[PDB]
Amino acid sequence: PQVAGLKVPPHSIEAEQSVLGGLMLDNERWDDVAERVVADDFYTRPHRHIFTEMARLQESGSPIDLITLAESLERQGQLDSVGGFAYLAELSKNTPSAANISAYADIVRERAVVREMISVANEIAEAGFDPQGRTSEDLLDLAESRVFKIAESRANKDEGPKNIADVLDATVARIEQLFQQPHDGVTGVNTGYDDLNKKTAGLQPSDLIIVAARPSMGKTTFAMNLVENAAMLQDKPVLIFSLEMPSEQIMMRSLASLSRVDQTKIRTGQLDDEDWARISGTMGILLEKRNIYIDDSSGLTPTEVRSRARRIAREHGGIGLIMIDYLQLMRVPALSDNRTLEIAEISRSLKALAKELNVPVVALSQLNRSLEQRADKRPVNSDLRESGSIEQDADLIMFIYRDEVYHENSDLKGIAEIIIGKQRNGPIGTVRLTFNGQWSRFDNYAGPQYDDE
Amino acid sequence: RDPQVAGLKVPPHSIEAEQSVLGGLMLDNERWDDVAERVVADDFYTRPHRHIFTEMARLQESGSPIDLITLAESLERQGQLDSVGGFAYLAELSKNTPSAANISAYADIVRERAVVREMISVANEIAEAGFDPQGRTSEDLLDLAESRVFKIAESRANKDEGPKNIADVLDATVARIEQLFQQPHDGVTGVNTGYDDLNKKTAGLQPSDLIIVAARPSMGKTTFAMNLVENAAMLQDKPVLIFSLEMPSEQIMMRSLASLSRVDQTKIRTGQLDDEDWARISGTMGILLEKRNIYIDDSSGLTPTEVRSRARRIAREHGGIGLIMIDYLQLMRVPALSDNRTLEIAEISRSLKALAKELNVPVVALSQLNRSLEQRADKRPVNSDLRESGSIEQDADLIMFIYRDEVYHENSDLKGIAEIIIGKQRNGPIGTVRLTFNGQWSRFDNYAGPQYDDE
Amino acid sequence: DPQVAGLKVPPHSIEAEQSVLGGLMLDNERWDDVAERVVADDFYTRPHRHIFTEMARLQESGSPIDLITLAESLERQGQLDSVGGFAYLAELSKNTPSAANISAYADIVRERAVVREMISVANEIAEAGFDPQGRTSEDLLDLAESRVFKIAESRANKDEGPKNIADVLDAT
Amino acid sequence: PVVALSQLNRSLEQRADKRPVNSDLRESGSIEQDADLIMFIYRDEVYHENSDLKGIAEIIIGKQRNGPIGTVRLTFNGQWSRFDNYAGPQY
Ligand SMILES: Nc1ncnc2c1ncn2[C@@H]1O[C@H](COP(=O)(O)OP(=O)(O)O)[C@@H](O)[C@H]1O
Ligand SMILES: Nc1ncnc2c1ncn2[C@@H]1O[C@H](COP(=O)(O)OP(=O)(O)O)[C@@H](O)[C@H]1O
């Protein structure tokens, strides 16, 4: 066994032989070593067979030694796969030492996260020069999503092995949402509403959520007022893409939201007398809490949504509730790629990248002209008739409808009802936020819902 | 010294292009399910190269993966490293192979440097017969050449012809009239579904078919295809895989734990608000780690060529068949065409039916229908409502269309009665397997709990 | 050499790498839109990169970019020598009469360098991963992280408007 | 002075006016941009029947190096295989 500098994949064999002898003898180090080493880690195929027997018995309230290793393995028939007790007894020579066991749970960890970084630098180089990526810019979009998902909790592999142990524990660890917020300020990024968050239960934290509204409905009014109630409230770098407005026009709206001043006041009868009190109030709390980022370029291919939203999730944790106003402006590189198949590559690259970053992606679209020939003018599912591929690949869908823009003497003035049509992990309903649009703010202390019976 | 390009007795040979086939194979194990497709043994030019791929074969069937290290100990015992090159040679092809780049391109070359190298050495021994006939009555020479030029044979695996007959199938035919072992009067041949209603139309899921679920979107499409894979992991003890392309891993289990255990989802939506049901939770948590059956992978950039490089690395390193479910296959994209869906479906029609016949696995894929159903006054799906698709109406073997009346109406007497219209059926009749939608717990119970049968 | 030597050559499209340099040298009013989609260090071979840098700001800096204005600016910079000589400048000007489809040869050298630089990223992630020096898994998962996003490529100050600079609050 | 002869592909018939434009020899590249006197050939009584240019072919110059372009017409007797004198009609 010569020790030299060669090109070998990194793994240790004695160290795998060191741990398994310890847990064969001891059933008390299992308090420790089950925390930091999981399955799928050991090199040779028999080695994790022993580890699953170490796991199936230890939940079963049965001990582990060289005796019971033979017992279930002939009830399960795997005994001649590992080699019978002819090889398990060679693991009965390893360690009387109950020390360096976590240090041997460390080297077999250390040689197995580098080893999960050779099948990423070959899942790239076998996409290149054998193109299952077929263009350059979407060959980088797969060159990122096998890299940013690594820089993670690091119990993460690339993709493909997930035994139901390694997801059940990370499910119950994500039902540790039990000591903080016993009220229904549910696990998602909040919207800041006690009318919405009983019906949505928050914006569920890995879901593509689609807003749509007509023109003359105030679409970016709601999408910034939801973000401004989710930027000063949940600590995460909220990115915003917007193409309906230019960059500065958004900030001219948000300062009219946070400081509750009129936006007619911001350009006519300017920042003069006592509006300085509120604007210099919200130019301090927004000043250093580095949350809202905004980018507003015009050619936004769905390659260059990911490759802008990767940096945002790199520098931070990143539960950046990405707001992309006006999805139809997103223009794919192929031009003869038409509107039946333009959005069907956008419907399947937001939902497929609202999932890595665990970001509830709010994107914004609009309903066609044939909406406005109905009587009950509500934006329903069958009026997203541009492509019909986003109507079926979203998670939460909120169809905005303000009544006094389409009617005059009716008493539902200023009552925007956010219709929740497609609700996946919950029930449907109907919200009524209060359209206080002279500053573009919504909540329902003046609550337009009946609220009595 | 040797003379110039006029020396061409080396017929073809590719030795520089060979060491970069073993090179990346010495430094990767994920790519043996590719180079074995298009390079078999006895293609290489040099005899030390053949014993390397010889003992790269047994270790891949034994499961032990290959580096420099696990090879040489597996060449220490077998009496090798003396005539294969030595332990320095394995380091000679580890230091001088910098390419962790591409093996799928040097593998095609050694194939097409060997066919030409063999068809030269065929024509040096058929045209040696006229060059020296020592007398074998030339009609009987003519079956030598049929044995020479057709000795180029590639029998690496199962079903072929020549060594094939119908009596060689009739032993396998009486092998699968060896039922009435587990079910003396009761049930199914293949993999179960676990219902009193579905097992008399499909008679279980057939062990090489491609059962297609289709449904109007979020009208109960993953309520079914997880309930069924719930019922088919306590009933098989095999690696019953899942490809959830739509949902994330944390969100799959937060319905199945409400379905295996039948806790209500409001106890898992918010914070858990009972300590009676925690045993109902922790019991079925223990049941689900009593049997390590259900697998999950939540990719979302799935070509239908990289499906095969997952679902063969589960059924090889573990048990056999399982039930390779793939959720919502439009989210699978093929980047080859980037065309109308009437061709991008056609690679998935021709690859899922090429994965349900290597591994003999009932691939439960899922699709949806086009929006023009929403104007047909008989909204129940038929085969003429997959107009977006193309070829999936033909390649499938069991097509289930899931209507649900209470999601498209509110006068529904079918309150919680999800119905299953069997659109295509290969090996049986068609009909309506009406179930009880109890997706409060993500459940589909059976309608013979309620009053009537499956009319 | 035999033709198995197509192994260390990322695609790089020399025919598409010469028709752009013949496109600007005959048409000065195409460097406005071609230099948008194509930047330097996408050109594969060393003469083509620095020639594209020799048009430094020479759109509006008072030089119509022909062979004459190039050759004078080459030698005051000092590179009329064997990084192109002057005969290859005729091979770049007169042998390339290329049409108004430079925007077709623009996307090639955009898309044959991205696929090229995703090989040395796919090498220098992996070749470090076989020789572990005095640095742990917290190094390599954060040196493979940054080295991939060095291939945005580089265009301009973007991706981050408001609070970051925080000045796009103050640009309002 | 090398007369060379060439043909066009059926992309031209996609256009309504079938006059042979300069950008129909671009489809191979080195003939459109190395030609010195392109002289396209049209003829209407083979592409139509009711045209009054019957037998009178119109050579369309598409490029000229050291002079003007235009539309030079020629008459042709449809029996002798001989193109002939001045540009048969008035203009
Ligand atoms: N002074 C104002 N009073 C009322 N509404 C205003 C005022 N200024 C701007 N708005 C609203 O801002 C909205 C712009 O937001 P957006 O959602 O993009 O529009 P739409 O609802 O047409 O999509 C417009 O609908 C307009 O009604
Ligand atoms: N509390 C509930 N009440 C009624 N239905 C529910 C409830 N919770 C979940 N569901 C149902 O679960 C289904 C899940 O939809 P699903 O078929 O998984 O969507 P997809 O087609 O995207 O996979 C929804 O159709 C919804 O009707």
Author numbering:
A (entry chain C): 19 to 471
B (entry chain D): 17 to 471
C (entry chain B): 18 to 189
D (entry chain A): 378 to 468
Could you share sentences copied from the article?
Chromosomal replicative helicases are hexameric protein ensembles that travel ahead of the advancing replisome, dissolving duplex DNA into templates for DNA synthesis. Melting of the duplex arises from ATP dependent translocation of the helicase along single stranded (ss) DNA, paired with inclusion/exclusion of DNA strands from an internal chamber. To assemble such entities on DNA, bacteria use specialized loading factors that mediate opening of the protein ring, guiding of ssDNA into the exposed chamber, and, finally, sealing of the helicase with ssDNA trapped inside.
In the identified complex, we observe five λP loader molecules bound to the helicase at five consecutive DnaB subunit interfaces; the sixth DnaB interface has been breached, thus precluding a sixth λP from binding. The λP loader restructures layers in the DnaB helicase comprised of carboxy-terminal (CTD) and amino-terminal (NTD) domains into novel right-handed open spiral configurations. Restructuring breaks one of the six helicase subunit interfaces to produce ~15 Å and ~20 Å openings in the CTD and NTD layers, respectively; these openings are of sufficient size to enable access by ssDNA to the internal chamber of the DnaB-helicase. Taken together, our findings indicate that the λP helicase loader induces a conformation of the DnaB helicase that is neither optimal for DNA binding nor ATP hydrolysis. However, binding of the λP helicase loader is not compatible with the dilated form; indeed, the NTD and CTD tiers of the BP complex, by virtue of arrangement and size of internal chamber, are found in the constricted form.
